[PDB]
Design a protein around this motif. Structure first.
Motif, mmCIF file in Angstrom:
data_model
loop_
_atom_site.group_PDB
_atom_site.id
_atom_site.type_symbol
_atom_site.label_atom_id
_atom_site.label_comp_id
_atom_site.label_asym_id
_atom_site.label_seq_id
_atom_site.Cartn_x
_atom_site.Cartn_y
_atom_site.Cartn_z
ATOM 1 N N UNK A 85 54.732 32.797 -17.823
ATOM 2 C CA UNK A 85 54.817 32.679 -16.372
ATOM 3 C C UNK A 85 53.594 31.957 -15.814
ATOM 4 N N UNK A 86 52.459 32.127 -16.482
ATOM 5 C CA UNK A 86 51.247 31.398 -16.127
ATOM 6 C C UNK A 86 51.509 29.895 -16.086
ATOM 7 N N UNK A 87 52.209 29.394 -17.097
ATOM 8 C CA UNK A 87 52.609 27.991 -17.129
ATOM 9 C C UNK A 87 53.633 27.694 -16.037
ATOM 10 N N UNK A 88 54.481 28.673 -15.746
ATOM 11 C CA UNK A 88 55.591 28.474 -14.821
ATOM 12 C C UNK A 88 55.105 28.505 -13.376
ATOM 13 N N UNK A 93 46.682 31.249 -8.987
ATOM 14 C CA UNK A 93 47.353 32.393 -8.384
ATOM 15 C C UNK A 93 47.238 33.628 -9.271
ATOM 16 N N UNK A 94 47.183 33.408 -10.579
ATOM 17 C CA UNK A 94 46.898 34.483 -11.525
ATOM 18 C C UNK A 94 45.434 34.900 -11.450
ATOM 19 N N UNK A 95 44.577 33.965 -11.054
ATOM 20 C CA UNK A 95 43.195 34.288 -10.715
ATOM 21 C C UNK A 95 43.122 35.027 -9.382
ATOM 22 N N UNK A 96 44.052 34.714 -8.486
ATOM 23 C CA UNK A 96 44.145 35.406 -7.206
ATOM 24 C C UNK A 96 44.508 36.874 -7.402
ATOM 25 N N UNK A 301 57.122 29.350 0.676
ATOM 26 C CA UNK A 301 57.081 28.771 -0.660
ATOM 27 C C UNK A 301 56.848 29.847 -1.717
ATOM 28 N N UNK A 302 57.029 29.475 -2.981
ATOM 29 C CA UNK A 302 56.753 30.381 -4.089
ATOM 30 C C UNK A 302 55.769 29.762 -5.074
ATOM 31 N N UNK A 303 55.097 30.611 -5.845
ATOM 32 C CA UNK A 303 54.212 30.145 -6.906
ATOM 33 C C UNK A 303 55.009 29.600 -8.085
ATOM 34 N N UNK A 304 56.290 29.945 -8.138
ATOM 35 C CA UNK A 304 57.131 29.595 -9.277
ATOM 36 C C UNK A 304 57.624 28.156 -9.169
ATOM 37 N N UNK A 305 57.336 27.359 -10.192
ATOM 38 C CA UNK A 305 57.631 25.930 -10.157
ATOM 39 C C UNK A 305 59.129 25.688 -10.008
ATOM 40 N N UNK A 306 59.929 26.576 -10.590
ATOM 41 C CA UNK A 306 61.366 26.357 -10.695
ATOM 42 C C UNK A 306 62.003 26.258 -9.311
#
Length: 370
Positions: A85-88, A93-96, A301-306
């Protein structure tokens, strides 16, 4: 009480019941475990209180403020980062959502701001803020206004005063110093000098607001505006010539506004941590889950690239994602909120002619250093 076969979720103020009820109810059908949604109103107020009793929500969704609350207070069970998910999503945001070397939330949604301009009015967007006020004079001849902003709000005052060097903070080596800040200098006094220039020239009305700009675009009355997550109201391009770009620079400093990320954490008191954490990361953070909520009401918006790529197909978001990646996560700490208001008074006093720059600016920095 909390019991296996059911869990409670609290959602950020940006949605009441509906979206979380949708995704929760669908999850309830899939695992057969009862999903109970509560209203944001109680979310902030009860969260600390129900933790004292050790019974309440299984998971908590907020933006910034809760992150410190439940993390420092130990109100949440520690979670670990997901490589896939980090890649995704996005590393920042994972640092957030990471605290003390362990993850304390998941990134649900992204909010960011951008500068919006009409290609129908302006043949080319501005590179610097200095162009705005002179431009305002030019297209004024056509009965139009080039840039719309809220001066009486802290949102504008900061990026105006700070941009020329009137920073309300000193930040160095991961440390803030409120006593050695950049508002007690000549640079901030320069901020009010310019700030009043265009508003004293009546380039905006006292009742002027961002929502008016959104309406004005419909007729083409306003060339540009400042907007962000609110842009859902009425910012989009269909059968028209509109364009959008993140904030330009002023006096050699970026107007790039701060970036907000929705964070969702696992309650330490929850016996259901395993299934609660599972669906949060796996079901909410997927093109289906965050789509289900956004489909009910524009979340921004979302953090998710998809899904991010899909929603980014709207002009209103596409730019804000650039600021999101190139911006900074709610870095400006509680102290800056008061500083924004301290400087907010300054611009009012300068604009109204109640105080000089010397008086108003000194008062602003005095409050900051108070």
């Amino acid at each position: 009480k909390i019991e296996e076969g059911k869990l409670v979720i609290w959602i950020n103020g940006d949605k009441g019941y509906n979206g979380l009820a949708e995704v929760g109810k669908k999850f309830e059908k899939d695992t057969g475990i009862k999903v109970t949604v509560e209203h944001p109103d109680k979310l902030e107020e009860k969260f600390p209180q129900v933790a004292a009793t050790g019974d309440g929500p299984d998971i908590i969704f907020w933006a910034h403020d809760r992150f410190g609350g439940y993390a420092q207070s130990g109100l949440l069970a520690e979670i670990t980062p997901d490589k896939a998910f980090q890649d995704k999503l996005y590393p920042f945001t994972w640092d957030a959502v990471r605290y003390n070397g362990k993850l304390i939330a998941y990134p649900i949604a992204v909010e960011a701001l951008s500068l919006i301009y009409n290609k129908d009015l302006l043949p080319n967007p501005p590179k610097t803020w200095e162009e705005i006020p002179a431009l305002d004079k030019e297209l004024k001849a056509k009965g139009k206004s080039a840039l719309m902003f809220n001066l009486q709000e802290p949102y504008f005052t900061w990026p105006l005063i700070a941009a020329d060097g009137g920073y309300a903070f000193k930040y160095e080596n991961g440390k803030y110093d409120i006593k050695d800040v950049g508002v007690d200098n000549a640079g901030a006094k320069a901020g009010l000098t310019f700030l009043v220039d265009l508003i004293k020239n009546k380039h905006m009305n006292a009742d002027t607001d961002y929502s008016i700009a959104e309406a004005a675009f419909n007729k083409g009355e306003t060339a540009m505006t400042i907007n962000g997550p609110w842009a859902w109201s009425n910012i989009d391009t269909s059968k028209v010539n509109y364009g959008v770009t993140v904030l330009p620079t002023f006096k050699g400093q970026p107007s790039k506004p701060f970036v907000g990320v929705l964070s969702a954490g696992i309650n330490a008191a929850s016996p259901n941590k395993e299934l609660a954490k599972e669906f949060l990361e796996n079901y909410l953070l997927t093109d289906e889950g965050l789509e289900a909520v956004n489909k009910d009401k524009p979340l921004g918006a979302v953090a998710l690239k998809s899904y991010e790529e899909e929603l980014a197909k709207d002009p209103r978001i596409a730019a804000t994602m650039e600021n999101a990646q190139k911006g900074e996560i709610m870095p400006n700490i509680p102290q800056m909120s008061a500083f924004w208001y301290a400087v907010r008074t300054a611009v009012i006093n300068a604009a109204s002619g109640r105080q000089t720059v010397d008086e108003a600016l000194k008062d602003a920095q005095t409050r900051i250093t108070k």
